[PDB]
Amino acid sequence: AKKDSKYAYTGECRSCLENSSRPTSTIWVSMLARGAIGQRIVATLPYIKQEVPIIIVFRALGFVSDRDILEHIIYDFEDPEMMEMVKPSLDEAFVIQEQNVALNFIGSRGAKPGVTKEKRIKYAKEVLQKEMLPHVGVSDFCETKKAYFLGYMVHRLLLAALGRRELDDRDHYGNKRLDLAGPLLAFLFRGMFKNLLKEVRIYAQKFIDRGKDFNLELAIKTRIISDGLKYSLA
């Protein structure tokens, strides 16, 4: 909870693949400060420079019915405090009632310009499938898993907003991780291996373009990995 900000409470999640895609796609699910009918819940998704209400995200994931959305966010319908705290975001995002419309909304808010709604929608769909909460899964048909996790994130934001839970301490070392030589060299090796495959791609491209074979022994610039690790550690 930032004292000086437009948001009262912010539930973030630096998401990363179990053992790949080192860049940690940070996703935020914030609540607008009381200062308007109620308190609105939004989500600063990656590759999008504009906040989006959670309800659009849930509908873009294939859960259009508001009952299904609440079933994913609030697990106990016997909590009228929870319904009253989630009501403003629902009332603020109801004109959208289909997955395609929600995806188009996301694609319209995406950093990339929506030259065509089709590309725009596809842009979003792949963002919600790859960038949003990658640790939960980047494959297809996992929208249920992503919906449940985002619902739990909203549940955590509501528990913090209603005070039934304590805010998380940024200094608690149980909430920290130590990147040792292993993960550090792994991050460098990944980026440098990518650069190596890049140089090999360009080499083989400019050779096959002449209609002839190419030698990987000559394409593989071993100096990339060698001098890279050497420079970083030096």
Partner 1 sequence: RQLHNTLWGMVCPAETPEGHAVGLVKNLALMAYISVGSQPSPILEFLEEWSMENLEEISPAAIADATKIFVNGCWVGIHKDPEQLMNTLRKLRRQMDIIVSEVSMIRDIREREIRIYTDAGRICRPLLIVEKQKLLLKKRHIDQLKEREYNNYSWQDLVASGVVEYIDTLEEETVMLAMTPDDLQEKEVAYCSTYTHCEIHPSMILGVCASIIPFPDHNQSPRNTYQSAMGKQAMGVYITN
Partner 2 sequence: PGFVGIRFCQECNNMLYPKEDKENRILLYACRNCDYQQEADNSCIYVNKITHEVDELTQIIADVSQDPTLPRTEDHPCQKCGHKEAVFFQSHSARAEDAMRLYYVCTAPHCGHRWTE
Partner 3 sequence: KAKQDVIEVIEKAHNNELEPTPGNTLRQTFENQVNRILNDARDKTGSSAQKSLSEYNNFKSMVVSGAKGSKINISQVIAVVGQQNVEGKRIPFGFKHRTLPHFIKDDYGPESRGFVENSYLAGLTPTEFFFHAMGGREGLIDTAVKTAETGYIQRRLIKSMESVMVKYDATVRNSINQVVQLRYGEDGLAGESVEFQNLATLKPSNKAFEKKFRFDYTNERALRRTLQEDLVKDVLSNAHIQNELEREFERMREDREVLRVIFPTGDSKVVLPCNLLRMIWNAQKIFHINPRLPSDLHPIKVVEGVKELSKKLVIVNGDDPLSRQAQENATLLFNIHLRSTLCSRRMA
**Which positions lie near partner 1, rule CB under 8 A?**
18-19, 71-72, 75-76, 135-136, 144-145, 148-149, 152, 165, 169, 171-180, 182-183
- Considering only 87, 112, 117, 206, the residue that binds partner 2 (CB under 8 A) is 87
* Residue ranges of E strands in the chain: 7-15, 25-32, 41-44, 52-53
Provide, rounded to whole angstroms, the least separation between the CB of residue 66 and partner 2. Answer: 5
Q: Using the rule CB under 8 A, give the single segment among 21-29, 64-72, 143-151, 206-214 that binds partner 2.
A: 64-72
62: alpha, beta or left? (left if phi > 0; alpha if psi -120 to 50): left
- Considering only 18, 166, 213, 217, the residue that binds partner 2 (CB under 8 A) is 166
Provide, rounded to whole angstroms, the least separation between the CB of residue 183 and partner 1. Answer: 6
- Considering only 2, 5, 81, 215, the residue that binds partner 2 (CB under 8 A) is 81
CB–CB of 99/69 below 8 Å? no
Spatial separation of the C-alpha atoms in residues 188 and 194, rounded to whole Å: 10
CB–CB of 137/149 below 8 Å? no
The continuous run of DSSP H or E covering 58 comes out as helix 54-60
- Considering only 164, 176, 177, 212, the residue that binds partner 2 (CB under 8 A) is 164
221's contact among partner 1, partner 3, partner 2, none, with CB below 5 to 8 A by partner kind, is none
Nearer to partner 1, 145 or 221 (CB): 145
111-131 burial code (b ≥16 CB/10 A, e <16): eeebeeeeebbebbbebbbbb
Nearer to partner 2, 79 or 199 (CB): 79
Q: How many other β-carbons are positioned within 10 Å of the β-carbon of residue 222?
A: 9
- Considering only 10, 12, 33, 68, the residue that binds partner 2 (CB under 8 A) is 68
**Coil, helix or strand at residue 148:** helix
Nearest Cα residue to 128 out of 155, 156, 106, 161: 106
Residue 3 as a binder of partner 3 (CB under 8 A): the answer is no
Provide, rounded to whole angstroms, the least separation between the CB of residue 73 and partner 3. Answer: 25
Of residues 164-223, which lie at the interface with partner 3 (CB under 8 A)?
A: 166, 169, 171-172
> Six-digit token pair at 86?
């989630």
- Footprint of partner 2 on this chain (CB under 8 A)? 65-68, 70, 77, 80-81, 83-84, 87, 90, 94, 97, 162-164, 166
- Footprint of partner 3 on this chain (CB under 8 A)? 166, 169, 171-172
